[PDB]
Assembly symmetry: D2
């Protein structure tokens, strides 16, 4: 059991296909005690989480609500029992208005919208560290989720630009985080079939949405030396737990690529 | 002459210390017929432009102003005579509330503020692109000003994150600018003491900021294999003018490091 | 146990301060049955390995010897018993003649000598993948030691170049090793005083070179957001064990930074 | 004219479709006094060099020839008149045995051949810099030819490794030419149909060469935001002149991308 002891916060669950779900599962399979946080559809996230191995707490956290952020360390400490601190925080959060995604012209998305995506997808990583680092033991990890925005691509539009700032924010978080002996990292996963995969990126594609298999399976399974599997999230979960473990103890402000090696290949 | 005949629009002039002032001057010397935009202190900017070698038109461009961007389309054409287009555009524009800068803590920066910075620092590259690309001739360049943000650093804080996104946006303009025959690039300059810079370097933004800003400005020259001068703005103006020219016709979505080679060395 | 049941070959031990030795000890601690290789002073190496927490077989491997490579495939299976195969291979091997290193100019190293360093430090990575992939299991892992050569530096000179090579070779091996079910990566470690290093650090390879040394070695702890101490190889000896394990299953051709996060920071 | 009165040494011409040939032509149009260096078939190079828009001195230079480099500064001074110096060096030199190219398996290229490949196409950039830096005026430029080696790719095999070091070397020539006030940069060009393309890459690629070649132009013009045409060598010739002129006066140890901007895009 790799994450034994280790109390870990885990945000961004919505379905049993949602990335955070498998991070949560694999964590529990390795002896982690969890605290999970939801957003908007709580009765529904609630139903989902019972499928996880252990009975685990569920806090509400709209990452745009300044009140939810203040009362966060509060609500958490009362869930793992005061005295005990957090060893891990997982940030699997993202949103971006459909107006700056897929076939909708890049120039046409308004800043009002792109701000919302950037607030949730990237800034919220720093605002969560503010909230949680206090209630964290030294040697514990923060892990956030990233998709390689280092090159531009069709569809991913303004979410590329957001994830691009996520990366930057993550290198500045690892400094504040290090003051407490805590690491801050992102995992750059390949594509995984989840809700956002199909609803956000999927719907904003419209007619040229048959692209999603050409582009993708082209840029990933074809490129990856060990193959990629859009239907298999356990790889990226296994990788997220490695950063939560003590086994990458000198890695911080970094990005790990769980993408089948596809960013290191051109063809 | 170099930019002979070409019609370049240049934004971001505020003083004669400003990067935009030099890009403008060096341009004019090479035969560029200009158009300028300023922001806020228009009468004060009017004074400074008359110091440039030749007289050039001046337009008001609040980059946050929805009206301005829209009419900007026309106001320019009315300024160079309809039946004439721009063969280049320079975006030397930037901002961040003294809270995502300096001694001011990284976490303390409110998103309300971090956004106002990003709106002006990064997004407005796409703003101007959509605004102006219709009145742009094939063969033209768009050149934005950038500061190497791939690594974190003290004080610069949320401006790094904004510059980090501005780079990602640059690659998504490159794609749309490509329709019209235009290249999109950033010149990553090293530091020049200006209105914005020298403010935080004297302790106005804290004594511990001006401290960390020495180590930067000094250690930069050390690394630069051909040296670095905070006071000479001419080489970056010269480099920006090279992209405006006919001489880099295979560069787009890309970044040119005009930093005296500093980013390539470790010590 | 982490490598519980895995049978890993570890090259490159020469003292009890070699990055190798620690990788091997930590690997043994986690339940990994081992096989080792040594070079040159084989008699003294014998002494060293015995101080390991477990008995391990020792093979001779002059990575330049085109014969040693040829038999190596077989000599190993002989050492773990036919019908058994390796679940991991480690490559902590490197060498550069004191002419492309130190007070010695960059220009003065002859190609004869530069090549020797490149044969042992870079090419010899594919050398061993060739020799060993046949006898490797699926799920297996290849890991070799890297030192961040993306930016140039004083003194390291040609070993810098040979790492830039080694980095590229790693991405190719990944393609070939992917055929057998095997990931191939590099742990990019910070500086460790491991004899090899600590030689130049005291004035052996010049006093001005040893000067430029501690400016790096200390410039590191300052940059590293969680700090970095050069006398402790246990953080990196673990990050190697992370890749050998089954917890990094989506990563190949990649480079992991166990450097205390100093490659992410500028200051 | 752009390079008026400047004296420039261009190596590695061998056809009228060689890249160094177009670099020569375009420089002369800008008004440069050239000095060329060929290799082996010096008499045939001579027939080709009269095709140039001017007459210019042609020397013999086997970069693998200890005598040639040794005499090199000599027979150059002699051919531009003494008291005069160089302002420009173009390094357009490359080679790798067919054994480490195309479909010829990667592990099977012997280090014997992989070494010759490096030395010539990589090391030689440093050994020429030594040869000429003495005889260069401050303000000059050394320029190399590079293919983007950051990600791996089919066929380009061990030549990816050479170019992968040709960069690491170029960052060390940068700081030794720093001493003399001279810049050292590489131009990463896109694919351009030349002799080497057809003989070494399309030669060691079997019957399926030319098929991958037609499919590369397509899948590059695609990725390029401003398109790309393999038959036109002009744009990369124009980019290398931009690096010789005064106009990128603060760019050294760096790489300029002349690929139509394809590396910044993923699809
Ligand atoms: N599956 C992919 O292809 C993929 C690959 C790499 C990285 N990512 C990133 O990793 C994460 C995983 O996303 P996913 O694939 O699981 O889709 P998902 O929608 O199932 O998970 C994303 C989560 O965002 C949460 N969320 C949305 N708005 C919020 C707000 N205002 N405040 C707090 N939470 C909010 C949702 O409740 C949801 O559970 C995201 O950050 C995403 O951008 C996804
Ligand atoms: N000073 C340096 O050392 C340096 C180095 C590298 C990159 N840069 C970048 O170059 C650009 C400008 O640098 P600078 O030294 O000239 O700063 P500056 O303060 O001297 O002038 C920059 C411009 O910001 C403009 N601006 C602010 N808000 C605006 C808005 N809402 N709408 C339109 N314009 C607005 C101002 O009007 C001003 O003219 C920026 O993008 C900056 O990040 C500066
Ligand atoms: N010392 C550090 O701080 C440091 C940091 C990052 C990466 N590295 C890398 O890690 C590896 C080893 O570093 P180290 O700290 O263990 O120093 P070390 O000298 O103790 O280990 C280097 C190895 O070179 C081996 N060697 C030389 N020629 C050989 C050949 N022909 N065949 C087989 N082995 C040969 C030696 O036997 C020795 O074990 C290298 O690849 C090196 O560049 C070292
Ligand atoms: N062909 C492309 O599209 C392309 C793209 C990016 C970079 N490049 C680079 O540009 C340069 C030239 O390639 P090219 O397209 O002009 O092919 P080319 O063969 O027409 O020119 C290459 C030159 O290398 C010379 N050469 C080979 N061995 C030599 C040696 N031992 N000493 C001195 N000269 C030697 C050749 O004789 C020839 O003149 C190389 O560095 C190459 O890798 C080419
Ligand atoms: C949570 C969230 C909010 C907002 C946006 C996305 C999102 O979640 C993600 C969903 C999928 C991916 C990866 N991805 C994209 C597409 C694709 C389609 C077309 C072109 C190229 C990529 N396919 N696989 C990354 C994500 O971050
Ligand atoms: C217009 C504008 C508004 C708001 C902020 C910046 C800005 O413009 C810039 C001005 C100078 C630079 C370069 N730079 C960095 C530093 C430094 C500072 C603090 C700490 C360590 C380094 N000094 N000089 C970059 C800019 O983007
Ligand atoms: C195995 C081997 C053979 C030959 C040479 C090196 C070598 O191995 C390494 C030893 C130490 C390092 C890390 N490192 C570099 C320096 C340093 C010195 C001068 C300037 C700036 C850095 N100090 N610590 C990396 C290595 O690859
Ligand atoms: C001078 C020299 C000696 C030896 C080898 C190359 C060389 O020079 C070059 C020749 C052509 C290119 C461009 N390129 C690559 C390939 C390709 C085909 C298939 C897959 C992936 C790449 N096709 N076109 C680049 C070069 O640097």
């Amino acid at each position: 059991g790799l994450l034994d002891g280790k109390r870990i916060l885990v945000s961004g669950i919505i379905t049993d296909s949602s990335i955070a779900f498998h991070i949560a599962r694999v964590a529990q399979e390795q002896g982690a005690q969890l605290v999970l946080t939801g957003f908007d559809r709580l009765r529904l996230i609630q139903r989902i989480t019972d499928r996880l191995p252990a009975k685990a707490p569920l806090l509400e956290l709209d990452v745009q609500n300044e009140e939810h952020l203040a009362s966060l360390a509060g609500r958490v400490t009362e869930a793992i029992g005061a005295g005990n601190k957090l060893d891990g925080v997982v940030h699997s959060i993202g949103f971006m208005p459909q107006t700056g995604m897929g076939i909708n012209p890049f120039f046409d998305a308004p800043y009002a919208d792109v701000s919302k995506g950037i607030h949730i997808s990237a800034y919220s990583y720093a605002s969560m560290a503010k909230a949680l680092l206090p209630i964290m033991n030294p040697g514990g990890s923060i892990v956030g989720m990233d998709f390689d925005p280092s090159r531009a691509m069709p569809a991913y539009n303004w979410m590329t630009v957001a994830k691009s700032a996520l990366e930057s924010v993550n290198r500045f978080v690892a400094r504040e985080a290090g003051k407490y002996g805590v690491r801050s990292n992102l995992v750059a996963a390949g594509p995984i079939r989840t809700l956002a995969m199909s609803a956000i990126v999927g719907g904003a594609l419209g007619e040229e949405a048959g692209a999603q298999a050409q582009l993708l399976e082209e840029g990933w399974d074809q490129r990856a030396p060990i193959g990629w599997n859009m239907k298999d999230a356990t790889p990226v979960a296994k990788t997220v737990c490695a950063l939560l473990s003590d086994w990458l103890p000198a890695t911080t402000g970094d990005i790990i690529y769980a993408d089948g090696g596809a960013h290191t290949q051109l063809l």
